[PDB]
Amino acid sequence: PLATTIDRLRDYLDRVGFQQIYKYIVAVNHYAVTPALITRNTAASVHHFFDSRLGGRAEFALLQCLMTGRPAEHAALPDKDRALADALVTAGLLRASPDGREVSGADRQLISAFGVDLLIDRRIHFGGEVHEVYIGPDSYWMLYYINASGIARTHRAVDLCTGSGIAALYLSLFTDHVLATDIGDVPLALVEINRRLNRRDAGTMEIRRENLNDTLDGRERFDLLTCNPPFVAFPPGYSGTLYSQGTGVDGLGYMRDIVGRLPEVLNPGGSAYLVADLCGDAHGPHFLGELESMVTGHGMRIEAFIDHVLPASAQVGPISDFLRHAAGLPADTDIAADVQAFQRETLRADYYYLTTIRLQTAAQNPGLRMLRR
Numbered sequence: 001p002l003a004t005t006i007d008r009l010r011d012y013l014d015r016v017g018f019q020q021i022y023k024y025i026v027a028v029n030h031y032a033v034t035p036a037l038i039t040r041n042t043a044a045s046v047h048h049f050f051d052s053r054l055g056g057r058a059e060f061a062l063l064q065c066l067m068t069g070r071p072a073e074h075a076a077l078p079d080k081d082r083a084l085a086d087a088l089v090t091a092g093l094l095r096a097s098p099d100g101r102e103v104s105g106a107d108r109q110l111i112s113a114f115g116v117d118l119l120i121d122r123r124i125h126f127g128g129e130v131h132e133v134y135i136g137p138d139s140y141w142m143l144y145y146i147n148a149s150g151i152a153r154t155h156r157a158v159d160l161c162t163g164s165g166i167a168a169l170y171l172s173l174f175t176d177h178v179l180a181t182d183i184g185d186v187p188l189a190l191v192e193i194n195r196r197l198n199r200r201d202a203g204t205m206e207i208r209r210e211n212l213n214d215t216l217d218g219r220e221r222f223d224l225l226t227c228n229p230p231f232v233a234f235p236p237g238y239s240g241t242l243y244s245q246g247t248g249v250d251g252l253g254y255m256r257d258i259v260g261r262l263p264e265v266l267n268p269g270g271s272a273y274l275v276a277d278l279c280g281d282a283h284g285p286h287f288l289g290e291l292e293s294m295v296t297g298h299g300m301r302i303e304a305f306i307d308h309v310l311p312a313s314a315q316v317g318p319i320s321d322f323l324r325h326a327a328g329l330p331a332d333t334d335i336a337a338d339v340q341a342f343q344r345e346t347l348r349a350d351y352y353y354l355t356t357i358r359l360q361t362a363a364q365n366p367g368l369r370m371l372r373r
């Protein structure tokens with residue numbers, strides 16, 4: 001039943017040109033920048049666009065339920081859309097009002113990214129409950145740097161720590177062989193939905209419940225790898241979330257795990273694309289110093305694209321707020337002092353550098369290249 005409901009959702013999105021509507025609303029100079037475009041802060045302007053520039057047409061009513069959560073009167077939905085709305089309510093992907101007279105948003109927000117149609121966790125952009133599936137601008141910038149024209153239909157690709165599935169689904173635009181992995185129940189259920197929503201199935205995209213270190217140890221070899229792993233370092237004693245908290249003393253343990261196995265897991269000449277918000281000093285991120293061992297030790301070419309720089313002081317608030325909300329802590333806990341001390345003493349973080357890293361084995365021009373503006 002869920003698979004049929006997603007097929008009917010796909011049909012609706014095609015019928016009313018969802019991806020084109022989304023692309024027009026956000027425009028080409030924002031579409032690939034961030035998924036945080038339609039949010040609680042911009043929803044009223046989205047509604048005004050549908051009401052005034054699209055004339056309030058009923059064929060777009062269900063679409064707005066999915067995009068912003070806006071209510072639509074059940075009886076005002078066109079007949080085909082109405083039955084689909086009922087199926088989405090049954091699936092928990094939309095809500096009905098208590099009297100059943102309207103349909104509105106649940107916890108899933110419909111966006112488009114990199115040519116794919118994607119349900120994401122609505123709580124990241126709306127409302128006040130902590131989200132359970134991550135997506136963000138780092139997700140996008142990882143994909144931005146992939147040279148799509150170099151992907152062959154027979155290339156074997158893996159998206160580790162797939163989350164919503166965005167990177168795996170992007171790769172599936174080009175290759176017929178994609179593996180997508182995660183260990184969280186909630187993201188695994190969501191990438192199943194998003195795979196079907198883009199007319200993929202197990203014939204070209206495998207979804208696997210598997211720890212990233214277990215995939216990295218395995219004998220499967222890949223031509224292309226993507227991974228946006230948990231990479232944030234929180235002070236000792238604080239609980240984070242599955243998608244946020246990195247391993248190791250400085251949160252970069254998973255990045256180390258991946259990089260160390262790339263000479264074995266990648267076929268010769270294969271490429272990995274990673275992204276992380278990396279601690280550093282004024283010169284650059286500390287992690288890049290660890291990568292010279294891969295240039296010399298394995299002849300790799302490693303390119304680091306630094307696309308955002310923030311002083312560590314500008315992250316104290318966001319980190320502290322996230323920790324307070326995730327664990328349900330009260331407002332008299334001095335989290336900010338703990339974060340500041342941890343940044344200074346353990347991370348040596350004067351700055352955070354949002355960095356996409358491309359790593360290629362068996363490079364003809366080996367070396368480390370760090371790009372900063």
Ligand SMILES: Nc1ncnc2c1ncn2[C@@H]1O[C@H](CSCC[C@H](N)C(=O)O)[C@@H](O)[C@H]1O
Pocket residue numbers: 134135136138139140160161162163164165166167181182183184187210211212213227228229230242243244
């Ligand atoms: N040890 C592990 N092995 C595999 N997946 C893991 C993992 N630890 C955390 N995860 C998953 O790692 C993901 C990190 S968030 C990145 C999601 C997505 N690739 C994007 O770029 O938007 C989460 O979905 C989380 O569930």
Ligand SMILES: [Ca+2]
Pocket residue numbers: 025026027
């Ligand atoms: Ca706009």
Ligand code: NA
Pocket residue numbers: 228229230231243244
């Ligand atoms: Na991450």
